[PDB]
Amino acid sequence: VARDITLLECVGKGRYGEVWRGSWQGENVAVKIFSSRDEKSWFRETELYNTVMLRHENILGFIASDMTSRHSSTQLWLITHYHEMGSLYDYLQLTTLDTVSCLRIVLSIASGLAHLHIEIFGTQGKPAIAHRDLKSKNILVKKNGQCCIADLGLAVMHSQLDVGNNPRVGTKRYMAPEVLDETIQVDCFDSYKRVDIWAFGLVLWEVARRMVSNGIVEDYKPPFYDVVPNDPSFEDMRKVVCVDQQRPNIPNRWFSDPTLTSLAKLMKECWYQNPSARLTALRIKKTLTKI
Numbered sequence: 001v002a003r004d005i006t007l008l009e010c011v012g013k014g015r016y017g018e019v020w021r022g023s024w025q026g027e028n029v030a031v032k033i034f035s036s037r038d039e040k041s042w043f044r045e046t047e048l049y050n051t052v053m054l055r056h057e058n059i060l061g062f063i064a065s066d067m068t069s070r071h072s073s074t075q076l077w078l079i080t081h082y083h084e085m086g087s088l089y090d091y092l093q094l095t096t097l098d099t100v101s102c103l104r105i106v107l108s109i110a111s112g113l114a115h116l117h118i119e120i121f122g123t124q125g126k127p128a129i130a131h132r133d134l135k136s137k138n139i140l141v142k143k144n145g146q147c148c149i150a151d152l153g154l155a156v157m158h159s160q161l162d163v164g165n166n167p168r169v170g171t172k173r174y175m176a177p178e179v180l181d182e183t184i185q186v187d188c189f190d191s192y193k194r195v196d197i198w199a200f201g202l203v204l205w206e207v208a209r210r211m212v213s214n215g216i217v218e219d220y221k222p223p224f225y226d227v228v229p230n231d232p233s234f235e236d237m238r239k240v241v242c243v244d245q246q247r248p249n250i251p252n253r254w255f256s257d258p259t260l261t262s263l264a265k266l267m268k269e270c271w272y273q274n275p276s277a278r279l280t281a282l283r284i285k286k287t288l289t290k291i
């Protein structure tokens with residue numbers, strides 16, 4: 001139960017709500033406290049965790065979920081494993097990477113996303129799932145160096161089409177061109193997997209910037225830092241991604257490193273204007289395993 005949790009420190013704050021480091025039987029756990037405005041995101045992630053027994057080493061580990069609702073008060077809690085190392089967004093602010101740690105991180109993300117995307121049949125199976133709000137701030141760094149994906153509140157599902165009634169929409173900075181120009185095929189499940197692949201390519205660019213090659217590294221920057229203001233509007237991102245068709249700049253240093261060059265090619269194959277030309281999660285994972 002949540003009754004035996006002591007909230008210790010607020011480790012994250014946003015429009016979704018807050019994330020706290022909590023204590024439970026003397027062990028650290030994370031508690032996501034949703035704002036009442038995000039009730040549908042809490043329920044989606046709960047049914048994904050407790051009805052679809054969704055478990056994978058690169059998906060945030062679910063412990064429990066609780067809601068209490070009364071006149072003048074509503075609480076919505078998600079209790080998960082705590083990762084002291086924090087969000088990949090925070091982690092990349094402080095850390096530089098080498099060849100092994102860079103590929104451990106990005107391969108672990110690819111592995112979790114493929115696990116979301118690929119359907120499993122039978123008993124103890126799972127539908128195909130699209131995240132729809134992947135970004136560096138919803139990926140956590142585990143002690144072993146791998147990552148795990150969090151925030152499945154916007155997931156859509158499909159078996160041989162489940163879209164929520166969720167009024168919240170993805171982070172604008174990471175929205176795919178088909179989302180921004182509204183040509184996305186809403187009734188086609190593969191559209192949502194390809195919106196995920198787009199966002200993954202941006203996360204791939206974020207990680208690669210922090211890997212050192214030949215004694216050079218870039219500071220952390222978000223996708224499109226140079227052409228969009230902080231907290232960009234829908235219109236800001238359409239002008240950049242669709243009209244101007246701009247994409248993240250690839251610094252010259254990378255082409256001197258074989259690994260960073262391989263990731264540059266992978267990045268671009270996530271960024272096609274045409275969603276159908278983008279790689280699949282499984283192909284990305286199969287490539288990273290060989291690289």
Ligand SMILES: Clc1cc2cc(c1)-c1cnn3ccc(nc13)NCCOCCO2
Pocket residue numbers: 011012019030031032060078079080081082083084085086087137138140150151
């Ligand atoms: Cl249910 C959930 C959502 C989530 C992050 C966590 C849990 C989570 C788990 N351990 N942990 C450690 C630090 C931290 N978050 C977490 N820092 C705030 C980043 O918040 C991103 C929101 O996504």
